[PDB]
Amino acid sequence: SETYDFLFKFLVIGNAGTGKSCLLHQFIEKKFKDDSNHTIGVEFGSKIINVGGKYVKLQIWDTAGQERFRSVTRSYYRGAAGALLVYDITSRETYNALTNWLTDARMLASQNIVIILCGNKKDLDADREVTFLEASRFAQENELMFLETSALTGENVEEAFVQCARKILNKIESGE
Ligand SMILES: Nc1nc2c(ncn2[C@@H]2O[C@H](COP(=O)(O)OP(=O)(O)NP(=O)(O)O)[C@@H](O)[C@H]2O)c(=O)[nH]1
Ligand SMILES: [Mg+2]
Numbered sequence: 001s002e003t004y005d006f007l008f009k010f011l012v013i014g015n016a017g018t019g020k021s022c023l024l025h026q027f028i029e030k031k032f033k034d035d036s037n038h039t040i041g042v043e044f045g046s047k048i049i050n051v052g053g054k055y056v057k058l059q060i061w062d063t064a065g066q067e068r069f070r071s072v073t074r075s076y077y078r079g080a081a082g083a084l085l086v087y088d089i090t091s092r093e094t095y096n097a098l099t100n101w102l103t104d105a106r107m108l109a110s111q112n113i114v115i116i117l118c119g120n121k122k123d124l125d126a127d128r129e130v131t132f133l134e135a136s137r138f139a140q141e142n143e144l145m146f147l148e149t150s151a152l153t154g155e156n157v158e159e160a161f162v163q164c165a166r167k168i169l170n171k172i173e174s175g176e
Helices: 018-030 067-074 090-097 098-108 122-127 132-141 157-173
Strands: 006-014 042-051 052-063 080-089 114-120 145-148
Touching: 006 018, 006 098, 006 157, 018 042, 018 052, 018 080, 018 157, 042 157, 052 067, 052 157, 080 090, 080 098, 080 157, 090 098, 098 114, 114 132, 114 157, 132 145, 145 157
Parallel strands: 006 052, 006 080, 080 114, 114 145
Antiparallel strands: 042 052
16 A cells, blocks of 8 residues: 655675674564575565655665675676665674775776765674774765664664665756
8 A cells, every 4th residue: 555756675794793684674563673694596575765855765785795606796786776885893804894895886886876884793893903083083984974873772773774765866956
Protein backbone atom coordinates (compact mmCIF):
# COMPACT_ATOMS: atom_id res chain seq x y z
CA SER A 1 0.00 0.00 0.00
CA GLU A 2 2.86 2.40 0.88
CA THR A 3 4.12 4.43 -2.00
CA TYR A 4 7.15 6.55 -2.65
CA ASP A 5 8.08 9.44 -4.86
CA PHE A 6 11.78 8.46 -5.37
CA LEU A 7 13.77 5.25 -5.58
CA PHE A 8 17.52 5.31 -4.85
CA LYS A 9 20.13 2.52 -4.77
CA PHE A 10 22.67 2.88 -1.95
CA LEU A 11 25.75 0.89 -0.99
CA VAL A 12 27.36 0.37 2.35
CA ILE A 13 31.11 -0.10 1.74
CA GLY A 14 34.30 -0.34 3.83
CA ASN A 15 36.74 -2.77 5.39
CA ALA A 16 35.57 -5.99 6.97
CA GLY A 17 34.66 -5.72 10.61
CA THR A 18 33.79 -2.01 10.49
CA GLY A 19 30.10 -2.52 11.26
CA LYS A 20 28.37 -2.19 7.90
CA SER A 21 25.83 -4.97 8.48
CA CYS A 22 25.10 -3.73 11.99
CA LEU A 23 24.61 -0.21 10.62
CA LEU A 24 21.98 -1.37 8.08
CA HIS A 25 20.22 -3.46 10.69
CA GLN A 26 20.11 -0.48 13.09
CA PHE A 27 18.68 1.81 10.38
CA ILE A 28 15.97 -0.72 9.39
CA GLU A 29 15.12 -2.41 12.71
CA LYS A 30 16.29 0.22 15.25
CA LYS A 31 18.20 -2.44 17.24
CA PHE A 32 21.80 -3.79 17.54
CA LYS A 33 22.02 -7.27 16.07
CA ASP A 34 25.16 -8.68 18.54
CA ASP A 35 25.60 -12.07 16.74
CA SER A 36 26.79 -10.46 13.42
CA ASN A 37 29.33 -12.36 11.31
CA HIS A 38 31.17 -11.61 8.06
CA THR A 39 29.00 -11.00 5.05
CA ILE A 40 29.96 -13.70 2.55
CA GLY A 41 28.43 -12.20 -0.61
CA VAL A 42 25.90 -9.35 -0.44
CA GLU A 43 22.91 -8.50 1.80
CA PHE A 44 19.94 -6.22 1.09
CA GLY A 45 17.57 -4.00 3.07
CA SER A 46 15.04 -1.33 2.18
CA LYS A 47 13.27 1.50 3.95
CA ILE A 48 10.98 4.40 2.99
CA ILE A 49 11.87 7.74 4.56
CA ASN A 50 10.05 11.05 4.65
CA VAL A 51 12.24 13.88 3.37
CA GLY A 52 10.27 17.15 3.49
CA GLY A 53 7.01 15.45 2.58
CA LYS A 54 8.69 13.56 -0.30
CA TYR A 55 8.80 9.81 0.25
CA VAL A 56 12.15 8.23 -0.69
CA LYS A 57 12.58 4.49 -0.94
CA LEU A 58 16.17 3.38 -0.25
CA GLN A 59 17.31 0.04 -1.70
CA ILE A 60 20.49 -0.71 0.23
CA TRP A 61 23.21 -3.21 -0.68
CA ASP A 62 25.29 -4.12 2.33
CA THR A 63 28.55 -5.32 0.76
CA ALA A 64 31.28 -7.68 1.83
CA GLY A 65 34.34 -5.95 3.18
CA GLN A 66 36.76 -8.91 3.12
CA GLU A 67 39.48 -8.53 0.46
CA ARG A 68 38.54 -11.87 -1.10
CA PHE A 69 35.23 -10.36 -2.21
CA ARG A 70 36.60 -7.13 -3.59
CA SER A 71 35.84 -7.86 -7.28
CA VAL A 72 32.29 -8.78 -6.25
CA THR A 73 31.80 -5.57 -4.19
CA ARG A 74 33.23 -3.58 -7.10
CA SER A 75 30.44 -4.88 -9.37
CA TYR A 76 27.89 -2.92 -7.21
CA TYR A 77 29.04 0.63 -7.89
CA ARG A 78 27.25 0.78 -11.25
CA GLY A 79 23.83 2.27 -10.67
CA ALA A 80 24.41 3.31 -7.07
CA ALA A 81 23.25 6.89 -6.40
CA GLY A 82 24.64 6.98 -2.85
CA ALA A 83 27.04 5.17 -0.55
CA LEU A 84 27.96 5.14 3.11
CA LEU A 85 31.72 4.57 3.38
CA VAL A 86 32.47 3.13 6.79
CA TYR A 87 35.58 2.74 8.99
CA ASP A 88 35.99 1.68 12.65
CA ILE A 89 37.22 4.49 14.93
CA THR A 90 39.09 1.80 16.98
CA SER A 91 41.00 0.41 14.00
CA ARG A 92 43.50 2.66 12.26
CA GLU A 93 43.93 0.11 9.46
CA THR A 94 40.27 0.55 8.48
CA TYR A 95 40.75 4.34 8.31
CA ASN A 96 43.96 3.99 6.34
CA ALA A 97 42.01 1.90 3.77
CA LEU A 98 39.72 4.81 2.96
CA THR A 99 41.80 6.17 0.10
CA ASN A 100 41.54 2.81 -1.68
CA TRP A 101 37.74 2.74 -1.30
CA LEU A 102 37.46 6.28 -2.71
CA THR A 103 39.79 5.36 -5.62
CA ASP A 104 37.46 2.47 -6.40
CA ALA A 105 34.36 4.68 -6.36
CA ARG A 106 36.10 7.34 -8.50
CA MET A 107 36.83 4.75 -11.16
CA LEU A 108 33.63 2.63 -11.11
CA ALA A 109 30.70 4.78 -9.82
CA SER A 110 28.84 7.72 -11.34
CA GLN A 111 30.87 10.93 -10.98
CA ASN A 112 27.77 12.18 -9.18
CA ILE A 113 27.50 9.46 -6.54
CA VAL A 114 27.01 10.96 -3.03
CA ILE A 115 29.32 9.37 -0.45
CA ILE A 116 28.90 9.97 3.34
CA LEU A 117 31.90 9.07 5.52
CA CYS A 118 30.92 7.15 8.70
CA GLY A 119 33.41 6.67 11.56
CA ASN A 120 31.56 3.85 13.33
CA LYS A 121 31.79 2.29 16.86
CA LYS A 122 31.75 5.70 18.51
CA ASP A 123 30.45 3.99 21.67
CA LEU A 124 33.93 2.32 21.83
CA ASP A 125 35.58 5.71 22.43
CA ALA A 126 37.84 4.30 25.20
CA ASP A 127 39.62 2.30 22.44
CA ARG A 128 39.69 5.14 19.87
CA GLU A 129 42.56 5.02 17.37
CA VAL A 130 41.33 7.77 15.00
CA THR A 131 40.56 11.33 16.14
CA PHE A 132 37.42 13.29 15.22
CA LEU A 133 39.56 16.24 14.13
CA GLU A 134 41.89 14.16 11.88
CA ALA A 135 39.04 12.30 10.17
CA SER A 136 37.33 15.68 9.78
CA ARG A 137 40.39 17.03 7.90
CA PHE A 138 40.47 13.99 5.64
CA ALA A 139 36.78 14.26 4.82
CA GLN A 140 37.14 17.95 4.01
CA GLU A 141 40.16 17.25 1.77
CA ASN A 142 38.02 14.67 -0.01
CA GLU A 143 34.84 16.79 -0.29
CA LEU A 144 32.91 14.38 1.96
CA MET A 145 30.41 14.99 4.77
CA PHE A 146 31.59 13.09 7.89
CA LEU A 147 29.58 11.71 10.90
CA GLU A 148 30.69 9.41 13.75
CA THR A 149 28.05 6.69 14.22
CA SER A 150 27.19 3.83 16.53
CA ALA A 151 25.26 0.83 15.25
CA LEU A 152 25.04 -0.26 18.90
CA THR A 153 23.41 2.89 20.29
CA GLY A 154 21.94 4.25 17.07
CA GLU A 155 23.82 7.56 17.28
CA ASN A 156 23.74 9.38 13.90
CA VAL A 157 22.73 6.21 11.92
CA GLU A 158 19.38 7.57 10.68
CA GLU A 159 21.15 10.90 10.02
CA ALA A 160 23.78 9.29 7.76
CA PHE A 161 21.24 7.58 5.52
CA VAL A 162 18.87 10.56 5.45
CA GLN A 163 21.57 13.03 4.63
CA CYS A 164 22.80 10.86 1.73
CA ALA A 165 19.24 10.94 0.36
CA ARG A 166 18.83 14.71 0.96
CA LYS A 167 22.11 15.40 -0.96
CA ILE A 168 20.94 13.31 -3.89
CA LEU A 169 17.58 15.15 -3.85
CA ASN A 170 19.47 18.45 -3.89
CA LYS A 171 21.47 17.37 -6.96
CA ILE A 172 18.27 16.35 -8.68
CA GLU A 173 16.74 19.77 -8.03
CA SER A 174 19.73 22.03 -8.84
CA GLY A 175 23.31 22.49 -10.06
CA GLU A 176 25.91 20.02 -11.39
N1 LIG B 1 30.55 -1.72 20.03
C1 LIG B 1 30.17 -1.76 18.72
N2 LIG B 1 30.37 -2.90 18.03
C2 LIG B 1 29.96 -2.79 16.73
C3 LIG B 1 29.39 -1.69 16.13
N3 LIG B 1 29.06 -2.02 14.80
C4 LIG B 1 29.47 -3.27 14.63
N4 LIG B 1 30.02 -3.81 15.79
C5 LIG B 1 30.57 -5.14 15.94
O1 LIG B 1 31.69 -5.23 15.04
C6 LIG B 1 31.76 -6.55 14.45
C7 LIG B 1 31.61 -6.34 12.93
O2 LIG B 1 30.29 -5.84 12.62
P1 LIG B 1 29.65 -6.17 11.23
O3 LIG B 1 28.49 -5.27 11.15
O4 LIG B 1 29.41 -7.68 11.13
O5 LIG B 1 30.77 -5.75 10.24
P2 LIG B 1 30.88 -5.69 8.64
O6 LIG B 1 31.47 -4.37 8.23
O7 LIG B 1 29.49 -5.97 8.12
N5 LIG B 1 31.90 -6.89 8.16
P3 LIG B 1 31.94 -7.61 6.69
O8 LIG B 1 32.44 -6.58 5.73
O9 LIG B 1 32.99 -8.72 6.73
O10 LIG B 1 30.60 -8.09 6.47
C8 LIG B 1 30.67 -7.38 15.13
O11 LIG B 1 31.18 -8.14 16.28
C9 LIG B 1 29.68 -6.30 15.54
O12 LIG B 1 28.86 -6.66 16.62
C10 LIG B 1 29.19 -0.49 16.88
O13 LIG B 1 28.71 0.59 16.55
N6 LIG B 1 29.61 -0.59 18.21
MG1 LIG C 1 28.74 -7.37 6.94
